[PDB]
Amino acid sequence: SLNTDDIQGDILVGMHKQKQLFYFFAINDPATFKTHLASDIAPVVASVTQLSNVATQPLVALNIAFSNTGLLALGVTDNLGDSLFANGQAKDATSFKESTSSWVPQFAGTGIHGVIILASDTTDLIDQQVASIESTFGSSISKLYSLSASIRPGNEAGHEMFGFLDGIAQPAINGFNTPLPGQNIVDAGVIITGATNDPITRPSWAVGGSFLAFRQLEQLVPEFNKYLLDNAPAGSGSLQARADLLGARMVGRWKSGAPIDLTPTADDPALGADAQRNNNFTYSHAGFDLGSDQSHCPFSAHIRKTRPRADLGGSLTPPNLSAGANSIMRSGIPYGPEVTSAESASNTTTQERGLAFVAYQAQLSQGFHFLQQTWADNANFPPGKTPATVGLDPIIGQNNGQPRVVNGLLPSNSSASLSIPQFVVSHGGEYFFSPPISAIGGRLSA
Ligand SMILES: *[C@@H]1O[C@H](CO)[C@@H](O[C@@H]2O[C@H](CO)[C@@H](O)[C@H](O)[C@H]2NC(C)=O)[C@H](O)[C@H]1NC(C)=O
Ligand SMILES: *[C@@H]1O[C@H](CO)[C@@H](O)[C@H](O)[C@H]1NC(C)=O
């Protein structure tokens, strides 16, 4: 059973705040850094317990995670049991068929030793917390890069930059979460290192931690919206309706959060808002052949690519429990300004916006990296379909800068291909380890 007093809040429940700062640092003076890591940081790291209680929300929620080189800088030479983590994300870029030419320079390397996640309902509170941290740590810490993020405004709160409701689907942890209808149920050790049925040996101090895969993913929103208009399928619906339909068939959900599998032809806002219904599906449908039927949801839709459900076997009635070991916890948050009038008018992005993508898992090779490379980027995943060529994930699928060939999107002809420019541009990121809280003022400060 999980000790949620000792697990960092963002991993299992998220930060629960309007604003986030990702503060990427280097360690200049280990000894001094350690002193303050124990005295200043450890005591104020927010736990799952802490964030799960409405009466004990911190003014500023703080989490902290270390890269491989950061651990080395602290004299921690133990094998964490994750090759990908050890090599760093920059070395992994080829696996995702992307170039580091688009990367934040600070990410394209291993100079970053860690990330502090600060979360508060105002940026003023964040900024003062940064000032305090820099003032106590002094020259022992260097800020190399940072990214500001926020929940989107007004009625778009909870939606990402493309407009879609986000944070509906997460794995439920057996013995911790009470599962929602349709929700996958997994061993804790899928998410938490050293937890139930994590097969990989870890250092004792790392039990209760998780690997944090950070990705700065720019979204080209005006370009996305133009593509939908220009490539909307023919039909008696209005142009906007048919554009919206194409968007939903790429994502696998309407912007309200309603899963297209349960409502294939139109959005259903009441369904989208209902946590008891909006995940209650497997992709199976009575009277339809799972292997060929794309009339409810394309085989290539984002959410179907990243959680295949019945596509990888198991129950045809909810909940489908397939591929539990390939689950990630998502704590991403949008960044950048809202789309401006000039951008919307020209169809051309000038101001960088997108998703500060955060995925937690116990094994990077089974989680984010697997989902991206083996599923999203694989034109024959899921397997055993007709036609066999599913094409790439239209949202995150990558093929070295080339337009992505995506099949199944058009309801009237599942064989019809679309050649789609990237709407999401990786500016890279890093793999971190978020330790259990005990390790922060324990081993890591020792
Ligand atoms: C989740 O979906 C299932 C169907 O996949 C729903 O179960 C069905 O409910 C209807 C209406 O009560 C029954 O007539 C069917 O016999 C049920 N089928 C099965 C396989 O159980 C279930 O109600 C949905 N859950 C929620 C909360 O809406
Ligand atoms: C933006 O795209 C739309 C639809 O393709 C088009 O009608 C409009 O003219 C474009 N705007 C500009 C400035 O080209």
Ligand SMILES: *[C@@H]1O[C@H](CO)[C@@H](O)[C@H](O)[C@H]1NC(C)=O
């Ligand atoms: C469906 O698309 C395929 C592939 O482009 C094409 O060969 C076929 O003729 C199409 N069928 C119809 C009815 O358009």
Ligand SMILES: C[As](C)(=O)[O-]
């Ligand atoms: C999930 As059904 C009612 O289309 O078999």
Ligand SMILES: O=N[O-]
């Ligand atoms: O789909 N990541 O938020």
